[PDB]
Amino acid sequence: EQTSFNNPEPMTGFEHTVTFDFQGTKMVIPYGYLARYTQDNATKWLSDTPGQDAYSINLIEISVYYKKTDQGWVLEPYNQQNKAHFIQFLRDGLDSVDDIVIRKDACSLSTTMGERLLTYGVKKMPSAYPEYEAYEDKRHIPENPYFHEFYYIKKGENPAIITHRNNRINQTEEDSYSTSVGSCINGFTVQYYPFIREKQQLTQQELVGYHQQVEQLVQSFVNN
């Protein structure tokens, strides 16, 4: 199948969609979520190619700008208001834009991850969400006094594990948190490092809030 880059730069992110075929599953993505697939200083954007069915692929990476509001963090495609952040991200990666990796694949998250955390001495914590179980590990380790990890596990039909962790190793450094999310959403595995430019510790509400938008977004692509 032939590739083309014949869509102009977005103002809303919703001007065009690109249609993908994942082993027979149709995904229809608003092109503003596809910042990685542009040419000429992001003036040419990936497009559907007439004559061809749909890009037949195994995986796609969407990109979202994350923004503080008074109702919380929201995720946005490329638009005229946030464009400078995406352009900085495309230039060197140093802006508040995250990559979400979507693959059509069997879910490989076990239902026994929580058991394994507890088996290793991670502590079970009360959770702000009924659908999540929450875990924390802040053991004193002699050669790393800054160790701190959180885990949030969603089960049911669309499981997820969220790991938020302090990366600081030296006394001379500031605390530096980072997050990984592995999940399964309606036949896709969806893996990402959210809040990529955030060094500060995040609450369960900020993490789960982010992921809830990721699910809704991914489900919007297949729903049509």
Residue numbers in the entry: 44 to 267
Give the original sentences from the paper that presented this experimental model.
FrpD is a highly conserved lipoprotein located in the outer membrane of all meningococcal strains, and it does not exhibit similarity to known protein sequences from other organisms. Intriguingly, the FrpC1-414 fragment exhibits a very high affinity (KD ~ 0.2 nM) for FrpD, the other protein expressed from the iron-regulated frpDC operon.
The FrpD43-271 protein (FrpD), a construct lacking the first 42 residues encompassing the N-terminal signal peptide (residues 1–24) and the linker sequence (residues 24–43), has been previously characterized. The structure of native FrpD was determined at 2.3 Å resolution by molecular replacement using the SeMet FrpD structure and refined to an R value of 18.3% (Rfree of 24.9%). Both FrpD structures are largely identical, with a coordinate root-mean-square deviation (rmsd) of 0.56 Å over the 224 aligned residues. A single disulphide bond in a right-handed spiral conformation is present between the Cys150 and Cys227 residues. The electrostatic surface potential map revealed that the FrpD surface is highly negatively charged, except for a single positively charged region located at the β9 and β10 strands of the structure.
